[PDB]
Amino acid sequence: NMYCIDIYCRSRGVVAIRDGAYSLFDNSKLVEGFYPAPGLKTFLNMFV
Amino acid sequence: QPLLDAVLANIRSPVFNHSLYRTFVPAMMAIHGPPIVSPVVCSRKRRFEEDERQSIPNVLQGEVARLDPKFLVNLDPSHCSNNGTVHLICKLDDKDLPSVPPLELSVPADYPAQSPMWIDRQWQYDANPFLQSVHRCMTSRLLQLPDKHSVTALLNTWAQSIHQACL
Amino acid sequence: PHFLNTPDKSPGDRLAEICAKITDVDIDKVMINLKTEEFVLDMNTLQALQQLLQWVGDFVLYLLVSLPNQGSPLRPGHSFLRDGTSLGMLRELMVVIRIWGLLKPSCLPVYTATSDDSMSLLFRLLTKLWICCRDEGAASPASDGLVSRLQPKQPLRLRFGRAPTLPSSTSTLQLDGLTRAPGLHLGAYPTEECKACTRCGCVTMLKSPNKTTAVTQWEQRWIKNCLCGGLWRRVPLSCS
Amino acid sequence: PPPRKLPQRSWAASIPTSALNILLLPSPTPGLVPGLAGSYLCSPLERFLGSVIMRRHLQRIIQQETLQLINSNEPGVIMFKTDALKCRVALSPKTNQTLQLKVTPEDELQVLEKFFETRVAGPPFKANTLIAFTKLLGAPTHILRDCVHIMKLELFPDQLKWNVQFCLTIPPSAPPIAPPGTPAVVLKSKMLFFLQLTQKTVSIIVPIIYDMATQQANSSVAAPMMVSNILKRFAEMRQGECTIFAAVRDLMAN
Amino acid sequence: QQQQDFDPVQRYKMLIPQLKESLQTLMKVAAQNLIQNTNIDNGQKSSDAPLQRFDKCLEEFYALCDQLELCLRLAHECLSQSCDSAKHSPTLVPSLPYPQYLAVIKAQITCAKDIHTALLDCANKVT
């Protein structure tokens, strides 16, 4: 019930992952829920 | 209950309806960003060819072709070849006495048509008393038909009358 | 030349042209450095910025995201726009639309976030790349790495006007009479058709009566043949 | 054109990506997987989320009551009683743990304890392990006994080579009072500690009460046997009762 | 860490008005932006009222809908698990000892694995 990353697919053979706590808003506010930005997911993704 | 949005949204009735774009498609693009909505091969082709070129709407022939082999339907010289296309000549072939074929000229597919007109009524019917009684029973039963239907009711009633002829 | 201003030493557009001799950033400085007062024409100008001028704003945005795409399988990718002169012309357009927005709040912002004046930072990055490419400059400086950051403001889905052609190379091209075989930005472009929509083949894709009240400048300016406008065509909307 | 990861950032904006297949369908090897223990298919995303929630709980509990180190190049939040700072993760997916500090022995045993504490995290089966590691502060070779025990259990070097290892909490053979949440140690004169988890090829637990200045230990085969093994080797008193009693109760209790 | 007493019922009940009022607010600000742009295109300098950009509000509405949905899914998982546990497991929660329960569970798991292996061998022999 926290740290819910958002991965989805729209391309023909590729997919995209993104944070689920930004909501088209870098650092203005939050989504009134789960704690945001757990550690670092972007590098963990880009590693593989 | 939350109808404040309703009338103000309905305000934008006139022709200049483009600003809606700048109101919704960015936020939409936030949640829904689908490039794949209809990427499959798709093209609009209105028509290729359309005409009967052989007869009236198919329904009549399609239904009459489903009748018994006891009836034998054909066409006379084509005096209404294209629009009318309905003047049927039938030959009752069964365990009964034969007779003169009827006229059976119908109207458009709404079917308020007592199709037979008996073009050869007088002389063909003054021949014998038996067939005269057949004709009498035929017209008497036809009068009983409420909103007769040329498709099936005509031939069925005629066959019933021909089978009633044996007293 | 659409300014009904008061006369001065030189023409308004001519004096605006020399804006090239100005600093890199803070357009808000250079605008008052040249002139501020004599640029307003009339109250009835609130129809161009929010409707059609927004394009140019989005335009410069489409440059940023398209800047770091040299590794793409296309040497200029979408476009390059490294001329400088035309870029200087666009920068002059940016400063004049900036003073316009200073004269009226109905301008074209970033529309997304960080308003408390994104246009300022956009303009300063554009002037940076300009001065980095004006007189035989480099392409991809270290500044390129930092400007390559994707701010949460860039929109997409722009027209980029274009048309098909006749690629009949050597042998044969058989077509029917209809059913072809494969092989003005003042809004006026919804999803489905909403009027007669007299269009053109070059880039136009516009409306027939322009559906306006006092924007007759563009409409009358483009009633006749547009840029190579021999292809002013018409076609009705589909029906079920 | 898609590569824009020359510099770093602090925000995530639609990163693109077989990679999903590799990232999914949990493999039984959590990255390095030296082969200590764990017969469970651990997913990379699973262990990643586990590690991030572990470090979050760790910083929370170290900020709550104990002293910790201010933000710097590396977050040192392992600040135990005397001194300890090991919270750097070279391989982030695997684990965030290292050797705290060395000032005196009681040294390959230090590296062994570091590897054991790293493997002690594993899957996020329970965040109570954080409380356990927090309570792990026995300086005078007190933790060394359990460290060597767990190391021998995980490696089997050269209960009589049977299943004897209990580093977790909330045992089933504990005195039934309430389902425990995080029983690590008893802050009293006699600090409680789960001694071992005995099991045949049956199943029982064994606690211990180290007198930090009273270990009163099915039941018929465990409590009298343990009492006799304790009364027999009562001459362990230098660090007399440090690991001799533990080793006797482990091996010499049969 | 939430500590919401783990009871989903009153949580969802008390959260419903949030959805209601958020929908109300988003409809209101949408109508405001609509009247604004409809006075922009053809009216005059009348719409001078800085409202919400309609992005943050709608997105946080989606987010609260999301949170309530995940809470309801957790509630459903919990009730379904309770149901099947009651339906196919006796009540022994301190009259059988925990080792006996674990042994029974392991035996049932082994029997299920045996059934699965039998069905797999049947499918193999069929093919």
With an 8 Å Cβ cutoff, are B30 and E42 in contact? no
Taking residue B55's Cβ as centre, other Cβ atoms within 10 Å add up to: 14
CB burial readout D155-182, b (16+ within 10 A) else e? eeeebeeeebbbbbbebebeeeeeeeee
CA distance B3 to C200: 42
Dihedral of alpha carbons C137, C141, C146, C148, sign: positive
**Is C112 in the E-facing interface, judged by CB distances under 8 Å?**
yes
Nearest to E15 by CA among E48, E63, E50: E63
Helices D128-135 & D44-64 angle (0-180, nearest 10): 50
Enter the tokens of residue A3.
Answer: 């740290």
How would you classify residue D167: left for phi > 0, otherwise alpha for psi between -120 and 50, otherwise beta? alpha
The alpha carbon of residue C47 and the mean position of all alpha carbons in its chain are separated, in whole angstroms, by 16
With an 8 Å Cβ cutoff, are E63 and A29 in contact? no
- Are A19 and A6 a contacting pair, CB within 8 Å? yes
CA distance D195 to D186: 14
Enter the tokens of residue B44.
Answer: 């609009």
CA distance C228 to D209: 95
With an 8 Å Cβ cutoff, are C112 and E44 in contact? no
Enter the tokens of residue B37.
Answer: 């909505």
Nearest to B142 by CA among B122, B156, B121, B128: B156
Those residues with Cβ within 8 angstroms of residue C198's Cβ, 6 or more apart along the chain or in another chain: C206, C207, C208, C232, C233, C234
- Looking at the DSSP assignment, which residues form a beta bridge with residue D204? D198
CA distance B1 to E9: 26
- All residues of chain A having their beta carbon less than 8 Å from the beta carbon of residue E55 are 24-25
- Looking at the DSSP assignment, which residues form a beta bridge with residue B88? B75
- All residues of chain B having their beta carbon less than 8 Å from the beta carbon of residue C211 are 15-16
Max Cα-Cα span within chain C: 65
Partner residue opposite E99 with nearest CB, options D60, D176, D203? D203
E59: closest CA of chain B, how far (Å): 8
The alpha carbon of residue D63 and the mean position of all alpha carbons in its chain are separated, in whole angstroms, by 21
**Is C158 in the E-facing interface, judged by CB distances under 8 Å?**
no
Partner residue opposite C195 with nearest CB, options B15, B21, B45? B15
- Are D2 and D13 a contacting pair, CB within 8 Å? no
Nearest to C40 by CA among C74, C75, C3, C73: C3
Residues of C near B (Cβ–Cβ under 8 Å) read: 111-112, 155-157, 179, 187-190, 194-195, 211, 238
The dihedrals phi and psi of C233, each to the nearest 5 degrees, come to -110, 175
Over the Cα atoms of chain D, what is R_g?
21
Those residues with Cβ within 8 angstroms of residue D27's Cβ, 6 or more apart along the chain or in another chain: D41, D42, D43, D44
**Is C47 in the E-facing interface, judged by CB distances under 8 Å?**
yes
Dihedral of alpha carbons B118, B124, B129, B134, sign: negative
Technique used by the depositors? cryo-EM
The total number of residues written for chain C in this structure: 240
CB neighbour class for B138 (10 Å; exposed up to 12, middle 13-18, buried from 19)? buried
**Is B15 in the E-facing interface, judged by CB distances under 8 Å?**
no
Please, which contacts does A14-21 make with residues 24 or more away whose CB atoms are closer than 8 Å? A14/D16, A14/D17, A15/D16, A15/D17, A15/D20, A16/D14, A16/D15, A16/D16, A16/D17, A17/A41, A17/A45, A17/D12, A17/D14, A17/D15, A17/D17, A18/D12, A18/D13, A18/D14, A18/D15, A19/D11, A19/D12
Q: Please, which chains are in contact with A (at least 3 CB pairs closer than 8 A)?
A: B, C, D, E
Taking residue D240's Cβ as centre, other Cβ atoms within 10 Å add up to: 9
- Looking at the DSSP assignment, which residues form a beta bridge with residue D27? D42
Chain B CA closest to residue A16: B33
CA distance C24 to C30: 10
The alpha carbon of residue C29 and the mean position of all alpha carbons in its chain are separated, in whole angstroms, by 24
**Is C11 in the E-facing interface, judged by CB distances under 8 Å?**
no
**Is B37 in the A-facing interface, judged by CB distances under 8 Å?**
no
CA distance E16 to C219: 52
Q: What Cα–Cα distance (Å) separates residue C76 from each residue in B49, C70, C88, C116, C140?
A: 48, 7, 20, 35, 11
E101: closest CA of chain D, how far (Å): 12
| Resolution value, angstrom units | 4.8
D27 DSSP 8-state letter: B
- All residues of chain C having their beta carbon less than 8 Å from the beta carbon of residue A18 are none
Those residues with Cβ within 8 angstroms of residue C149's Cβ, 6 or more apart along the chain or in another chain: D9
Chain C CA closest to residue E54: C112
Spell out the alpha helix ranges (H) of chain E.
Answer: 8-41, 55-87, 98-126
